[PDB]
Structure formats: structure tokens, C-alpha cells
């Protein structure tokens, strides 16, 4: 009875989109900081001197 028009759109996974940027322009990733211990006050750890 006529013609049907088909439009298909797929937004791929940006992380898997090789050969280009790997995220959206406004996608911001923040690295989680590492946790450390501060209590060691004097801590003069001498190494073997070299000359």
C-alpha cells in the first residue's frame, strides 16, 4: 500500500568507542584519594650513604 521509512539510531558505549575520546564532553571522573597515616613524627630513616 505504500512506502515505510525507517530511522535507526544507536548511541554506543563511549568507554568502548576506540579511536577517539572515551567519554561525553561533560563526563567528569574524580580519582578517589589514597588513605595514609600521619603519626610518625621524628622518623629519620637513614639510608646507607654512597659516594
Amino acid at each position: 500500500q505504500g512506502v515505510l521509512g525507517i530511522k535507526v539510531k544507536i548511541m554506543k558505549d563511549p568507554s568502548r568507542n576506540t579511536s577517539g575520546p572515551k567519554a561525553l564532553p561533560d563526563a567528569v571522573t574524580i580519582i578517589e584519594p589514597k588513605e595514609e597515616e600521619p603519626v610518625l613524627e621524628p622518623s629519620v630513616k637513614d639510608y646507607r650513604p654512597t659516594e
Binding site: 629519620v44 637513614d46 650513604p49 659516594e51
Partner: protein, 320 residues
């Protein structure tokens, strides 16, 4: 004892960024090379005539980004500039042209150090590495060991070590919250120093070369022995100590706190004087603090480079 007063005698205007670093040569007492955020070095000739203590001589353009640390040579005729464009520049203090362009740091360089002699250039950069160069421009050594940015590296002067050793000892520190000692000929590690709660902003060996003074974010200033490898003392500044400097004549530590400039008398373990210039039209919460400190060769004048694009000199005027 030692009722010593220091009074601001001149202001060295002419820069356009924060005067990040200062340097002075022992041989030439009337020359002062200062680098600022305006990507330029300025050489100042000091005049003892009236209000202004100095006179700019030459501006050293050629740096694309922030100029962080400045070091003059021992003879007083050459100056090495570290900038935020990942490059180092060697300048003739009279010609005004650059001699060598040290390249190789993947992060912008934060500090540079001159050898005791005119042999080696020591540079610290944000790429967690230290680089040892010749005077020609090539990089001889790539010292690793720091897991974070290295903010400051200034050499421990050999005073009377046995006679002579031909060994070059210096210190390094940064956002690794550690202070490291290095020895060069070969060109390997030395003892460690771990005292800082926060990260180190600046370190500085004493003029003799046996005391190392380190400072950080928490204002916890530490003084250590290098030849003895032990702590010497510890103070708190309770503000942001941006830079610090020993003094040649007196046994003193100038510290550039976020509020003003403290001076610590080391033999008495007590601060003696506080330096806060008088500005106008501010709100007392953003007064321009100090980022560069440098004493004179004799120990009579102090140069402080602030964040208002100004060098201010405090001359020691003992009012009995």
C-alpha cells in the same frame, strides 16, 4: 639580647606577577635576580641613594608560562630560570640572551638548583622526578624515588667536609610528605627525613650546610641535621608558610606565613620579629602574603616578593 630591628627601606616595583623566587650571589652584592608570574625575570641593581632600594637592569623574556624558581650562578654572571612550560633557561646576566634551553621534563618545573661549582644543574618538576643536567643543556641523570610532585630542591653547601670529597649533597621535597637527601659525583640516594603531617612546600639548607629547614601546609617548620641525620628542632607557624630562608650572619629563619613574615631566632628557639606591611583598601582577609624570601650576602638586607607584584626590602637598622 641582640635588640635588632629591621625596617622596610625600599620597594622594588616593576614586576607584573607574584614574585615567586629570588636569588643573590655572594660575589656580586648589588645584583638581585627575581622571577615572577609574568613569565619574565628581572635583574635589579641596588642603589643606596633614596627611597627605591634597587633599579631594574634587564628583563628576560622567553618563558611561555609561570616562572617559579630562580637561581643565580656562583660567579654572579649567569642565572638559571625554572618555569611552568616544562623547560629551564640559562641566561647571561649581562647579554640578556638565553644560552641553554633544558628540555625533558614532562611536568612543569617547580624548582632548580645550582651546583656548588659550575658543573651540574639540579631541577625538580611536577613529573615526580629530578633531573641533573650539564651546563650545555643535556640531561645527565634522571633521579626517581618521589611518588608525587617535588616542589623544592636547594643544595647543601660543602663547608669543611673532608678537605674535599668531590661529592655534591642536596635535599629534595614536595607533596610526598617526605624530605630526601641525595649525593652526586655516583649520583645516588642518601638518608631520609619524615616529619611533616601535611606536604612540604619548601626546604632550605643552612648557609654552612649542616642544618636543613623544611616547611609545609600546616605551618610545622622542622629543622634537621644532614651530616648527623637527626632532627634539630620543631616549631609551628599556625599559618600557611609559603617560603623560608636562613640568614648568613645571624642564626635566623625567615618564614613567609600567610599572614606575615615571622623571624625565628634559632639559638633561643623563640621568634623575635614579625613583618606585616601596611596596605590600603583591603578587607584584612586577602592581604598580599609573601612567596619569595632572600637575605643579602652579608645578612644586612631582606628581599620579600609578595603576591601584589611587589618586592619589598627590609634593611636591618638596629635602633640600639
Amino acid at each position: 639580647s641582640s635588640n635588632i630591628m629591621l625596617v622596610l627601606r625600599g620597594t622594588l616595583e616593576g614586576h607584573n606577577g607574584w614574585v615567586t623566587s629570588l636569588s643573590t650571589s655572594a660575589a656580586q652584592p648589588n645584583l638581585l635576580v627575581s622571577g615572577s608570574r609574568d613569565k619574565t625575570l628581572i635583574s635589579w641593581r641596588l642603589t643606596e641613594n633614596e627611597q627605591q632600594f634597587g633599579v631594574p637592569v634587564r628583563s628576560y623574556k622567553g618563558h611561555s608560562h609561570i616562572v617559579q624558581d630562580v637561581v643565580v650562578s656562583a660567579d654572579g654572571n649567569y642565572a638559571v630560570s625554572a618555569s611552568w612550560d616544562k623547560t629551564l633557561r640559562l641566561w647571561n646576566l649581562a647579554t640578556g640572551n638565553s644560552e641553554a634551553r633544558f628540555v625533558g621534563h614532562t611536568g612543569d618545573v617547580l624548582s632548580v638548583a645550582i651546583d656548588a661549582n659550575s658543573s651540574k644543574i639540579i631541577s625538580a618538576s611536577r613529573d615526580k622526578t629530578i633531573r641533573v643536567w650539564n651546563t650545555v643543556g643535556d640531561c645527565a641523570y634522571v633521579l626517581l624515588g618521589h611518588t608525587d610532585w617535588v616542589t623544592k630542591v636547594r643544595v647543601a653547601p660543602k663547608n669543611l667536609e673532608d678537605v674535599d670529597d668531590g661529592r655534591i649533597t642536596f635535599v629534595s621535597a614536595g607533596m610526598d610528605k617526605i624530605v630526601r637527601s641525595w649525593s652526586l659525583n655516583s649520583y645516588r640516594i642518601e638518608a631520609d627525613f619524615i616529619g611533616h603531617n601535611n606536604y612540604i612546600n619548601v626546604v632550605q639548607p643552612s648557609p654552612d650546610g649542616s642544618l636543613a629547614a623544611s616547611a609545609g601546609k600546616d605551618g610545622q617548620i622542622y629543622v634537621w641535621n644532614l651530616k648527623h641525620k637527626s632532627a634539630f628542632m620543631n616549631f609551628d607557624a599556625k599559618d600557611e608558610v609559603f617560603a623560608l630562608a636562613f640568614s648568613p650572619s645571624r642564626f635566623w629563619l625567615t618564614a613567609a606565613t600567610a599572614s606575615g613574615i615571622k623571624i625565628y631566632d634559632l639559638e633561643n628557639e623563640v621568634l623575635i620579629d614579625e613583618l606585616k606591611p601596611e596596605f590600603a583598601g583591603y578587607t584584612k582577609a586577602q592581604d598580599p602574603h609573601a612567596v619569595s624570601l632572600a637575605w643579602s650576602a652579608d645578612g644586612q638586607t631582606l628581599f620579600a616578593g609578595y603576591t601584589d607584584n611587589v618586592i619589598r626590602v627590609w634593611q636591618v637598622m638596629t635602633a640600639n
